[PDB]
């Protein structure tokens, strides 16, 4: 990663063995459950493109998902090149060359160049741009590897309402979209798919009931 | 988090893999027992709103509780907005814009803006404000996920007094001061078994818990 | 905790996850054996009142003991207030308000105030004062949760003297008092409660025998 | 390794016990799976040739692979010597002698000489040059220890398409761009089972892997 | 402990949770085997008397041994007092009072006084003086808890010579130089079995242990 | 160990508990397999003679090997004294006394003296000299505790060539000597002791075949 030293300088630091192992283990244990995305974002805090590639490369298995990840990265790289065409010319002593999409992804850039972009004034955060592309691709994988659809989450006749809401929002979380779309699913399905006993109790509470109030009434 | 380096400067630091792992494991092992709140508060020491969102996001399962958490955060965010009406105008070179409720919660603010507020002079501690909202919401979850009421904790006829007081105060802690002193000293005696109850009335009012527990050991 | 940086300044540091976990685990594994007190004192090295409350709050179970701990803290807090009545008046720019008993215990003081007291010149060590109260209460719990009394430690007819002395001082350690009282128990009971074979051997050694000499003679 | 301290100076640091243990364990658990190469590259971040030799030396077993590694290193060392003919002469007070192939590999150079080259201005990065040779040799071992050829990866008649693509690209990664794109998009379809193959021809050319995998889920 | 920071200053540092845990575990697993002494000495590197008391206090069980340890410490403390008679008088602004035996042992001295002695110029190393007393007492415990005498270590008629020498020197280490050389070279041969003994007399005096072990492999 | 601080000064640092435990564990798990030597060298990076003695002393068991280690150290210490006779005379304010062999081994020198030698300008690296002697003795133990001789490594009639080469170089590695002697064993035995099918294939490849080429042809 790029961390701050004691002189106000942003300097490169080696990725720690604990960080490497933590990322490998979370993929091993959780596959592509939704909580793997925050794990990846935090473990790649301040990462260079090289560090991001290191983390993705150390993943064992799930190579179909990782290949989909590469395709998403290339799409974002192609879009970046269309939005930032490079301007030919000799690079000045101080400055650094403009980064292409393949430079952000770390395929055509060295670590020294990645450090130069990230520690520049103002910084060009190729690590955060690359991380955005990876997380975009990881969100697609979480979508695809989700076993259940939100329309199939129905409360059982003897299932506690808390367990039903657990399944509802677990399923809703794996279908990543805007909150306007997640609030729409809730207002469309959560009460309507509760079991008959709890459904009649919640409709009397009215639409203005909080989840806390809904869960309290169906205890 | 935002911590002091070895030379007195407030700088941003990445949340450590040990901190992330510790928080994930304690929720996995303890769910929403009362001791999860101090663990969260300590593990989020110096956290930015982004760190707090990271920690809450790494929680697997318990999405009903975590959704209740979002609603509590939105309630506190709305109250913050009502108490701090925004003043329109261009931001001066040095200062930073005043934060809204969604900025404290980290949904409409960048990490750099959060660092700017927290390292400002004087600091706007958006991380501690957000953490206050989260702990408020986590406390609601603990109280709701408490299975037993203090009125149902009664000492068995052959149950050691120590084990009964363990269960009593464990339950009282989950049933989240004016009433916690109310349960103590009078509900505790009333729900003791007849054998220990008779010993405790002889002690008279003003007995410490140590004196109460010593008198009912045998 | 409050640690020293590289400029001679005492600054606040976050309690580490390793420290939190270590304290939780030692309570889980050892309950209130006597060695939990040194574990707590070392793990709370340099702790603020907030850190001390964090450690006590993270304890799962043993809530009867922890409630006795609160009562001991309130007694010491009440005594501190009786010995240090606060003097009303506006606090000067540099100085800090005088700490009440509830401020030392962290119930009416902020972390910022605790840092101010502990890093003041001269420091008011509210963390060490609070720690004294907690350890006082923890010593009472170790006393109460000790299963055996020193008068019941008697050497068996075939029990090795070393195992008997192990039980003797293990029991004596859980009854915390002054060493004058622990030397009294030893001079009153250790030889007198050895089995007949070793007892007759030790009485011939005389009162001036060291424990090493006593254990060597009864091997 | 040679890392920057908290004040901008390039100083030598001892390889940590965690780094040593991590490298030993990953070889123990993963042998020469493709993901062992990124692990080695990251764990040897900033390494001197001595650190690289330490890491390779701590490997227990697999001495046939490790001997192949030595031969690859010697081949690259010989090429370095042919491209950098040595210039005889006394070394000036300030500078350092030019490194031979065996100096980069750490067999004829001391740790102090390696520090001198790596911290020179401009630096002679003997650690990264050596690491390049090692990873080149490790890549040869991975390819040789790959059990299956990409031509033998065919989807079973009842095998889920996801599992088939997992095996396909796992195998393709061990079979170490002009031909890796060649297997993709046409070998992948050709080795699918008749049921999914018929769906994939209807998608037409230009289908992404996401579109291919979505179409053969059921 | 009292360690140097990253800038040359001797400052107090809290004993780490890893150091505490390591010491507790080694006593739990190894009791008072001889290798417990080096572990204690290394784990107490730079320790104050308070740290040393902390480490000894965290030991669970073995209270007979730990009481023998206290008596040894008191013996050394009394000898220190006899060798350093106290000089009455008011302490000057700069200096520190001379330490008694109980001050070195940490029973009558505060942590701040211990820091003052250890960071003084010249330093009064109360931590290393105390540690010397503790290791002296720990050595007495190891010797007392050694089950076997060197005279009872004899090679079996079919026991490999290597295993016999392992047991011989393991026992000799617990039986805590003038006599340790005495057991070596002549007791070692005398307690070998007749088969290896006959080989070792043919080697003649002056044989190294390597030569002795090589000659009795088969 | 002796590490560099932030002022360019080489200062003493305590040996870490992780380093102590790692060395103890590797001896417990690997005994005296050849890879224990690199483990020891890396874990003793920058070690003082005191640290080296600490690591050797913490070894449980294998006391015959450790005694052979002491004898090797004394031989090297005696040779050092013969090559560096000490010159009597008062030590100047700045300088330090010349180290004897027993000073390098840490038996007659204090930690303060070891720090003085190692941080001197120019440094007298007693830690690296001692480490050389220990590794010399450790190499002798790996030799002696090797169960197999290189002449007994013969490929089985159905044994894969890769497994045979694994055994060959594992055995060759435990007999530590110069590479000229290890290249001699390879050119004398590796092809000659392959099974008849692979042996005839390799002899046709000729002596100029690499190991990669030899292993590919006998797959
Ligand atoms: C970098 C990473 C790790 C990230 C992130 C991130 C950023 C902001 C927020 C967030 C914070 C507070 C509030 Cl108040 C809202 C809100 N308020 S609102 C209009 O009412 O919805 N929106 N959002 C999310 C949106 F970005 F829009 F600002 C809020 C979050 C929250 C944090 C959180 C998690 C938690 F567990 C409980 C909380 F209290 C807060 N995380 C999510 O909300 C993810 N989530 N998704 C669903 C879904 F899909 F099931 F509905 C559910 C959840 C959480 C649990 C209930 C259901 N994270 S990242 C991603 O890049 O890797
Ligand atoms: C930030 C977090 C981590 C926090 C906190 C915090 C702050 C102050 C105190 C505290 C300290 C000392 C005393 Cl004297 C009182 C007291 N004195 S009083 C009139 O009698 O009430 N009050 N309180 C708490 C109140 F806020 F009120 F000021 C006291 C605490 C205490 C610390 C503690 C824990 C412990 F284990 C044993 C102790 F000795 C001290 N923690 C609690 O007391 C929690 N607790 N609750 C109940 C209940 F509800 F069952 F009674 C019980 C307990 C503990 C076990 C017995 C029963 N923590 S956090 C979480 O916000 O994230
Ligand atoms: C401080 C410690 C840890 C050390 C060391 C050290 C120093 C240099 C080298 C080294 C580096 C690169 C090349 Cl090119 C050669 C070479 N080139 S050459 C003429 O063709 O032979 N020689 N040597 C070794 C010699 F010192 F001479 F410079 C080379 C080494 C190598 C590192 C290595 C290990 C590995 F696993 C694979 C590699 F690619 C490189 N380690 C060894 O070679 C040990 N080894 N021994 C035998 C034997 F005995 F079976 F043949 C075998 C091996 C390695 C595996 C195959 C067989 N380490 S230490 C010791 O003090 O604790
Ligand atoms: C130093 C070490 C650790 C390294 C490295 C490294 C460098 C660059 C890239 C990389 C990044 C993004 C893209 Cl877009 C491309 C691309 N775009 S392209 C035209 O389609 O090929 N190429 N490459 C790699 C090439 F060098 F070519 F530039 C890309 C990588 C990627 C990182 C990665 C891994 C992942 F898991 C998922 C990702 F999204 C990105 N790693 C690989 O791709 C390895 N890999 N190989 C194959 C193969 F062979 F089976 F196809 C497959 C994979 C990954 C899983 C699918 C199949 N690492 S190292 C080791 O040297 O020590
Ligand atoms: C902060 C914490 C962790 C503390 C402490 C502390 C302070 C001083 C001493 C201490 C040091 C050396 C000597 Cl010479 C004496 C002595 N000399 S004397 C008159 O002859 O008795 N007194 N004391 C104790 C007294 F404070 F008075 F100065 C001595 C201690 C000792 C350390 C120790 C432990 C050990 F294991 C073996 C040792 F060699 C030394 N610890 C104890 O002694 C506790 N202990 N108690 C009993 C009892 F009850 F069974 F007798 C026994 C023991 C130890 C084992 C034998 C029996 N710790 S804390 C608490 O706040 O958490
Ligand atoms: C502070 C602590 C941790 C210590 C220490 C320490 C100091 C010096 C030495 C040492 C170093 C090298 C040599 Cl050459 C001699 C030697 N040369 S000589 C005439 O032959 O005796 N003497 N001694 C030790 C004596 F103090 F005497 F100067 C030597 C040691 C050695 C280190 C060591 C350990 C090892 F495992 C193998 C080695 F190569 C070197 N440790 C011992 O030797 C302990 N030991 N004891 C016996 C006994 F008793 F059974 F013979 C045996 C052993 C080791 C295994 C064989 C038998 N440690 S501490 C604890 O105080 O807390
Ligand atoms: Cl690490
Ligand atoms: Cl890269
Ligand atoms: Cl989830
Ligand atoms: Cl509920
Ligand atoms: Cl820092
Ligand atoms: Cl970490
Ligand atoms: Cl971790
Ligand atoms: Cl955020
Ligand atoms: Cl509880
Ligand atoms: Cl009780
Ligand atoms: Cl930590
Ligand atoms: Cl507090
Ligand atoms: Cl005990
Ligand atoms: Cl005994
Ligand atoms: Cl540093
Ligand atoms: Cl480490
Ligand atoms: Cl480790
Ligand atoms: Cl080397
Ligand atoms: Cl793979
Ligand atoms: Cl799929
Ligand atoms: Cl420091
Ligand atoms: Cl630690
Ligand atoms: Cl720990
Ligand atoms: Cl003390
Ligand atoms: Cl031993
Ligand atoms: Cl042998
Ligand atoms: Cl450590
Ligand atoms: Cl030493
Ligand atoms: Cl090997
Ligand atoms: Cl092969």
Numbering used by the authors:
A (entry chain A), C (entry chain A), F (entry chain A): 1 to 219
B (entry chain B), D (entry chain B), E (entry chain B): 1 to 176, 179 to 220
What did the paper state?
The cyclopenta-pyrazole (R4) ring of LEN appears to be a good target for modification due to its close proximity to the Q67H substitution. Specifically, our structures indicate steric hindrance between the closed conformation of the His67 side chain and the cyclopropyl moiety of the cyclopenta-pyrazole ring. Therefore, we replaced the R4 ring with a tetrahydroindazole ring, which also eliminated the cyclopropyl group and the two fluorine atoms present in LEN, resulting in KFA-012. This modification would allow for the R4 ring to be more flexible and, accordingly, less sensitive to the Q67H substitution. Next, we have determined an X-ray crystal structure of the cross-linked CA(WT) hexamer in the presence of KFA-012 at a resolution of 2.27 Å. When bound to the cross-linked CA(WT) hexamer, the modified ring of KFA-012 did not display complete 2Fo-Fc density, which supports the flexibility of the cyclohexene ring. The elimination of the cyclopropyl group on the R4 ring appears to leave more space for the ring to maneuver within this site of the binding pocket. The increased flexibility afforded by the modified ring of KFA-012 could in turn account for its enhanced potency toward HIV-1(Q67H CA) and HIV-1(Q67H/N74D CA). Consistent with this notion, KFA-012 exhibited an approximately 2-fold improved binding affinity to the CA(Q67H/N74D) hexamer and a similarly enhanced potency with respect to HIV-1(Q67H/N74D CA), compared with the parental compound.
